[PDB]
Amino acid sequence: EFNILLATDSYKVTHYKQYPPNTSKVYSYFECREKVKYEETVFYGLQYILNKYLKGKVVTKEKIQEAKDVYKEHFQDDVFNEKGWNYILEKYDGHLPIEIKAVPEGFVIPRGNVLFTVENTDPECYWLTNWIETILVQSWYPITVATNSREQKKILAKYLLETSGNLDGLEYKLHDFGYRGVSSQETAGIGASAHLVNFKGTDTVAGLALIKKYYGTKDPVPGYSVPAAEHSTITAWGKDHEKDAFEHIVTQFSSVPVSVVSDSYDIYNACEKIWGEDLRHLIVSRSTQAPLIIRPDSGNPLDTVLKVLEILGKKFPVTENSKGYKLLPPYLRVIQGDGVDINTLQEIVEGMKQKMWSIENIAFGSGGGLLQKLTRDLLNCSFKCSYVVTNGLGINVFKDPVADPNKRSKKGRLSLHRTPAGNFVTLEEGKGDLEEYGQDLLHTVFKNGKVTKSYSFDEIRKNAQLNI
Amino acid sequence: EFNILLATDSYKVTHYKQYPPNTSKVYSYFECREKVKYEETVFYGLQYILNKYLKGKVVTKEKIQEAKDVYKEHFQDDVFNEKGWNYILEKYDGHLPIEIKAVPEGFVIPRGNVLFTVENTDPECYWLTNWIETILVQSWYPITVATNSREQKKILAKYLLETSGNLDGLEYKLHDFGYRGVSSQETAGIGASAHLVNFKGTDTVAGLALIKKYYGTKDPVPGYSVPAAEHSTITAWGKDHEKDAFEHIVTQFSSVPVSVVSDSYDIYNACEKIWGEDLRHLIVSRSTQAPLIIRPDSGNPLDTVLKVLEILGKKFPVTENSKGYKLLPPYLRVIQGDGVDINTLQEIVEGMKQKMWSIENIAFGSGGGLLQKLTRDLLNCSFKCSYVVTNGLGINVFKDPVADPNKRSKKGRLSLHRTPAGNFVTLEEGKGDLEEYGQDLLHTVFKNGKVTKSYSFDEIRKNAQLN
Ligand SMILES: COc1cc2c3c(c4ccc(O)cc4c2cc1OC)C[C@@H]1CCCN1C3
Ligand SMILES: COc1cc2c3c(c4ccc(O)cc4c2cc1OC)C[C@@H]1CCCN1C3
Known part of the structure; x- marks a missing residue:
């Protein structure tokens, strides 16, 4: 009875129309933003969400029809992307073309670090990354x-x-x-x-x-x-x-x-x-x-x-x-x-x-x-787009509101590393690929409808x- | 895949051994206790719970065995009331012998009034009233x-x-x-x-x-x-x-x-x-x-x-x-x-x-x-036992903690009435039966596994x- 097409914030239904033309990739991340202190966070619960809501055949012809009919009345207009969802049903047997990388469950990580990343694995599904924000956040x-x-x-x-x-x-x-x-x-x-x-x-x-x-x-x-x-x-x-x-x-x-x-x-x-x-x-x-x-x-x-x-x-x-x-x-x-x-x-x-x-x-x-x-405000839990590819070019994206620097988001492709002292650091702008700080501590946990690490x-x- | 035998506070599994012997009736009620002041509450959401969780055949042999196995490990002891749950399966085809009376959904009621009541309809099921407190509360x-x-x-x-x-x-x-x-x-x-x-x-x-x-x-x-x-x-x-x-x-x-x-x-x-x-x-x-x-x-x-x-x-x-x-x-x-x-x-x-x-x-x-x-503390939402029948005798029951008079519960069988000025009053100790006010505003919404009013x-x- 759960329908992932009806498990998003209403406005996300209209987002495929709002991204820059020729966008092939949207890449987003979750962090407990910096500033009892709550200086470190226990990463727990993503595996429950991947297994219960995201894995396997989550798109059917009946689920597309049900969503089309609900959104027609909810918006009093035909804005629902039936074509995008049909593509996933026909091309991937209703499996989500998404890659999620995450820190291991139970890990204790200081505030202000990448905990997981989400990106589409097919260019036609650029809009899917943020569709599933509501369920992952x-x-x-x-x-x-x-x-x-x-x-x-x-x-x-x-x-x-x-x-x-x-x-x-x-x-x-x-x-x-x-x-x-x-x-x-x-x-x-x-x-x-x-x-x-x-x-x-x-x-x-x-x-x-x-x-x-x-x-x-x-x-x-x-x-x-x-x-x-x-x-x-x-x-x-x-x-x-x-x-x-x-x-x-x-x-x-x-x-x-x-x-x-x-x-x-x-x-x-x-x-x-x-x-x-x-x-x-x-x-x-x-x-x-x-x-x-x-x-x-x-x-x-x-x-x-x-x-x-x-x-x-x-x-x-x-x-x-x-x-x-x-x-x-x-x-x-x-x-x-x-x-x-x-x-x-x-x-x-x-x-x-x-x-x-x-x-x-x-x-x-x-x-x-x-x-x-x-x-969600206790640990400043936040999901933001950090990287898009538009006309074959990767651009580093972020917000930085003038009235609240604490809401500044991270830029570009992210990775999590051990520092020489054994602490954690999040590298931005794809700087993790230089391997100055060793290997990324995030693991692929979901790829194309399958849980890949548990x-x-x-x-x-x-x-x-x-x-102790 | 929901199992009502596994949808209670663990300690409730042990309560059938704690009630006075020869108890035939446990009657409990929900209110938003008195102290933005939030002087009145919108009664909404019980019908969701009745339909999703409480109605129809909610007991099966497999649900009883699943519960028995989980509780054996959870308590490291065999305290589960298998006989009580088997009685409901055999006698009522797994339908709950419970009556719930409620104020109409959408009603706006001042704090400190009965919103719904719960009682067992079969003497053997005295324990069931408070088993379902967790889901209802x-x-x-x-x-x-x-x-x-x-x-x-x-x-x-x-x-x-x-x-x-x-x-x-x-x-x-x-x-x-x-x-x-x-x-x-x-x-x-x-x-x-x-x-x-x-x-x-x-x-x-x-x-x-x-x-x-x-x-x-x-x-x-x-x-x-x-x-x-x-x-x-x-x-x-x-x-x-x-x-x-x-x-x-x-x-x-x-x-x-x-x-x-x-x-x-x-x-x-x-x-x-x-x-x-x-x-x-x-x-x-x-x-x-x-x-x-x-x-x-x-x-x-x-x-x-x-x-x-x-x-x-x-x-x-x-x-x-x-x-x-x-x-x-x-x-x-x-x-x-x-x-x-x-x-x-x-x-x-x-x-x-x-x-x-x-x-x-x-x-x-x-x-x-x-x-x-x-x-649950913003409107002081509370589910308490107000009436029991032990050895055929009805007794008004309540709590009244010395350090928090605001946690005093209501006594006996309850009813909700319109006052002559058009306000609401909760009558205690079965005084609603005197009919000095008009009709009880609580209606039967659930009886013996059926939703009776929607x-x-x-x-x-x-x-x-x-x-
Ligand atoms: C003319 O100005 C407005 C119109 C709306 C309409 C809706 C609406 C829904 C939610 C909401 O938070 C705000 C609004 C809204 C706000 C407006 O102005 C600020 C939904 C209806 C469905 C068909 C017609 N729509 C009009
Ligand atoms: C000897 O004192 C104690 C024993 C326990 C036991 C459990 C227990 C579970 C939850 C809880 O909040 C408290 C306790 C507890 C508290 C005690 O003293 C304060 C569960 C285990 C399963 C088999 C043996 N049980 C012992």
Whole structure:
């Protein structure tokens, strides 16, 4: 049912009429333009797009007719290029005559570098390069989710290492709760998969299926969850029976970790009186492999975390780890899953450290902040034409708006290189062909309807690892 | 290839073990909780979800086995409720034993009112009400896009009325440019469909297909566009040939409206020297039905709009309308489609009014600001359990967190009524059954796998009209 002829910005339908006459090549590129800092970006998600939308026979006689009929009404005019699309159907069996070169998935690249390039492989299809901009520029989302997720991992690693002396359990310190808070089922899958580049905990089941279909893992699944209560399973017992709900849930899940939302009526009373006194005998009996994870879900996230830890530290036996930081017993942990984004995550771990609480005690859950409150503007994700051939001559093209030099685009044929210090540089104006900086790091990943280079999710996770 | 058994928050897989024993009924509701204020919301998008995801045979033996295999690995344990899902397959031929009642689509409802309710119709399926919360709560996105778009329409209507004395072309004053700035193809269609509740201009073609399939219009399409240049079609001509690019494009599109991005190198030079002198002869000759629409795309959105209008006003014949506001000639208009969201739109029309420019002169295009930069928290969209039947006894259920009184949920069986002054009131604790108000405004839209009541896009548009 997907029709690539109907998967572009409307105005692109009219572009074949606007290019200079005798244009044989249009060459475009994607970058996260330069200027939390977000100095480096995780390149993730293009392989999903190539496989789901671009590869194989994407043009049929029925798809051309459907698009002709929609655009006739949408524009109230006959501007649709049926001839160009028929050419692709008849000459290439509806395979796109396009070459895409990209940096490997999971690579961590500084801002302002070429990440992928797109060009037509047939001169008659000069107009196709920018037709597919809309579908390829959506790459911004998994790039931005993967990047923002990795930036939160860097904060958790710094504070976990300072307060505990190791990074054990780091991949489980940020759990994806974003399924309800995203705009669609398709978005849930894409965003959850991008989070699983960096972490292993997710409630967003749609992410597992996407990874298995488009990337692959050695392991049966790329992420995991544990049993957890919500407000409906506590509040269903009645206002006077919160203790009965808690006793039932921890007894049902006595041998596995279990998360219990504790703020239905009064989080402080739940921690001090219900967990800390009435049900304490059911908690101190649990295995190290099956902790109670208390989940506050309302109020000021920092103030609530600090008060919950002070409460639990007075009702349960607290130890002092080798770094001097307080540690709850191994059958008891906290997860803060409300109001968490990269800024509040920083504030909580810093406030915990100042009160001498180990980051071993806490994990975070993020919903909207992890998968929804991100824009194409956060990393200045941009797709621009840099090179055309018109009357057999290559010309270097760019924009350079007077009022915003940050929107200046790169000129000519691009390539990505290692510098002598081992950093990245993007060469412009075809200067990569001089091989003063060695070989281009971009690889052909799509050519003429075929995916030509692919990466497993395992390779992507290894590429995206923290420097440590 | 969608499997409703795999379309929930993972933890919901475990909830059938957490509810009180002898629970026969779980009843839950959606609202935009009370605290631009966004005092009223456009209810839009549930019918999409009911038809795409919830209706008909959604359970098969193969879907149950697939779910069982995934959950075994995801939890490293066998917690999946295979028996519950098998019961629905055998007893209802895989149709969901759920009743959903909703306010009519397009209705504009004040914050803090019930918009829809969900309950199981079979006692064995008490667990199913909140299993489908994840899919249903995503209704927040079309509600929020439709609501934010209508709030922008209110600002434009106010300023167009004060500066021009009428609302002609209001439905073409905010164009959807959001396709590349959203997170997915599916989000693009949903968001574009929500904008078309209020406006007619879109570049997001995916919205048209969604409206045709799930809602329907008397007109062949719900939304329109005009030819437009992008930086690629101007810059491809070369840095020294911007004039040649502009001339080619307006000549190819001489008899239709055409938008031309004019900031590739220098927006001010383009307006004053290229449009205003070198190509002025190809502009002043155009039909009122085929204006040149100049599109700045960089800089401070307010400062750039006001400077562009000042430039054009010195190069082209400006009139003064009956309200005393300046009006460009009919063959010349402007569209600002960079940095536009609800706050900047207000800043620009207010700044224009202060410089005595009519809002007739300007349209807005919005991308990320219109379809992407919105969260479930903006309208406090929430799905909560309000009523359960345990041991044959009905109990009013709710949350009331000590630290956030704004997160208090409603109690018991709910109903939506007209007040004697013609406002809306949500009645709690089954008090709607006393019939002290008129009829419940919630109608059954889904029952036992069937969509029971459908709205056309034309009725939705009429419900969402401005006062
Ligand atoms: C021993 O303490 C813990 C164990 C887990 C386990 C998982 C887990 C998944 C997501 C998440 O957000 C947290 C956790 C977790 C948290 C714990 O303590 C805070 C999944 C794995 C699959 C088999 C064994 N499971 C253990
Ligand atoms: C006469 O001036 C204008 C006309 C239009 C027309 C459309 C239009 C669509 C989207 C949009 O954002 C703007 C416009 C527009 C803007 C104009 O002036 C600024 C679509 C319709 C389909 C047949 C006739 N078209 C006219």
